[PDB]
């Protein structure tokens, strides 16, 4: 419980049933598990990346403050989520921000805390040995850049392209920033195979 409590989300939904009156209205539920730290109902927090907005003519996001409306694992009553299991955290936000798995792989930490966001990300990557998950296993090629590859950041994900392809690391340009609580967090690279994006290396994010 030393680094910043981060819940690396996997699900996010809206409790409000179709036809719910404006009196028992709820925020959204956002659901992960507490690996570093512990989260609590009514706590100040910021979610990342969350919301994207047009600020000065380019593309960028907004880390979003709130507090928790309740915490639960299903159907029992508790109030402060400790480590262990996908915990569900219902918040004070808008629900339309959360439905349809918009922020799949969200991250939650404190609205007074530190997790960075970078359009250009440097990642030390290790090549995979063969085409694992497929019928057919062909050689792993040393490539040049400009190819478009899928980079999944822990529970986050993005596309990426590059201009300097160093031997061991990669300087990838994106369209959406990262959720990187500290060093060498596990973001994985997959290359298209026949519409199936399979592994071509495991990388760790240096910042």
């Amino acid at each position: 419980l030393s680094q910043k409590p981060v819940m690396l989300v996997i699900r996010s939904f809206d409790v409000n049933k179709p036809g719910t009156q404006f009196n028992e209205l709820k925020g959204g539920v956002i659901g992960g598990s507490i690996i570093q730290g512990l989260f609590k109902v009514d706590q100040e927090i910021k979610v990342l990346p969350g919301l994207r907005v047009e600020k000065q003519g380019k593309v960028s996001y907004e880390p979003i403050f709130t507090k928790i409306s309740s915490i639960r694992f299903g159907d029992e009553e508790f109030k402060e989520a400790k480590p262990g299991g996908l915990v569900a955290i219902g918040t004070y936000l808008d629900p339309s921000l959360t439905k349809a798995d918009n922020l799949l792989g969200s991250i939650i930490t404190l609205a007074d805390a530190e997790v960075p966001v970078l359009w250009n990300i440097r990642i030390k990557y290790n090549l995979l040995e063969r085409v694992v998950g497929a019928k057919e296993m062909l050689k792993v090629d040393p490539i040049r850049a400009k190819e478009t590859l899928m980079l999944s950041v822990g529970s986050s994900t993005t596309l990426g392209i590059v201009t300097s392809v160093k031997k061991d690391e990669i300087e990838v340009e994106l369209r959406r920033p990262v959720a990187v609580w500290s060093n060498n967090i596990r973001t994985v690279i997959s290359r298209q195979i026949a519409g199936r994006w399979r592994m071509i290396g495991w990388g760790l994010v240096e910042i």
Partner: protein, 36 residues
Amino acid sequence: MKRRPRKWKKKGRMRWKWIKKRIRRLKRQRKKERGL
């Protein structure tokens, strides 16, 4: 674009307006496209 008006004559080529517009879609690119 520092016009050179020998090209509009449309003789053995294509219109000029609709070539300018397409060169923009590549200069805007090699400027944006990892030309950073």
